[PDB]
Amino acid sequence: MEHVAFGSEDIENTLAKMDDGQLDGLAFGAIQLDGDGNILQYNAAEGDITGRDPKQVIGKNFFKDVAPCTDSPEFYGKFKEGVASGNLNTMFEYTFDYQMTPTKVKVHMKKALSGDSYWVFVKRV
Numbered sequence: 001m002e003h004v005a006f007g008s009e010d011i012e013n014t015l016a017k018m019d020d021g022q023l024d025g026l027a028f029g030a031i032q033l034d035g036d037g038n039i040l041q042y043n044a045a046e047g048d049i050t051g052r053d054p055k056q057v058i059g060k061n062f063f064k065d066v067a068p069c070t071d072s073p074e075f076y077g078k079f080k081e082g083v084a085s086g087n088l089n090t091m092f093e094y095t096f097d098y099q100m101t102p103t104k105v106k107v108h109m110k111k112a113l114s115g116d117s118y119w120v121f122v123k124r125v
């Protein structure tokens, strides 16, 4: 395991040092998105929660292609306000239900350290 707690205050500093292999050792799901919502990184824990194959979803658009249930003011709307303003730090519960058993999760979205990149962190609740 790579020990990092979900919700930690300096999580973007800690994860800036990790390659794809180290991201797969986290205890929670982690997705890195660019400012258009395309998936740059997607770890093994996220694939275990959602059933998606991490290697196949890289390069797809999260809001248009992979996760249409997040195309809503409650999720995508918060993301796009964050990208526009250049700052984002929000945590909320949500249900993922597209082509899968509905699964309740806690989501934490936070701007990365790398300029136009954004994290989505996910844990079961």
Ligand SMILES: *C(=O)/C=C/c1ccc(O)cc1
Pocket (backbone or CB within 6 Å): 031, 046, 050, 052, 066, 067, 068, 069, 070, 095, 096, 097, 098
């Ligand atoms: C709703 O369509 C949610 C889908 C989803 C959430 C998170 C993922 O990693 C993959 C699909």
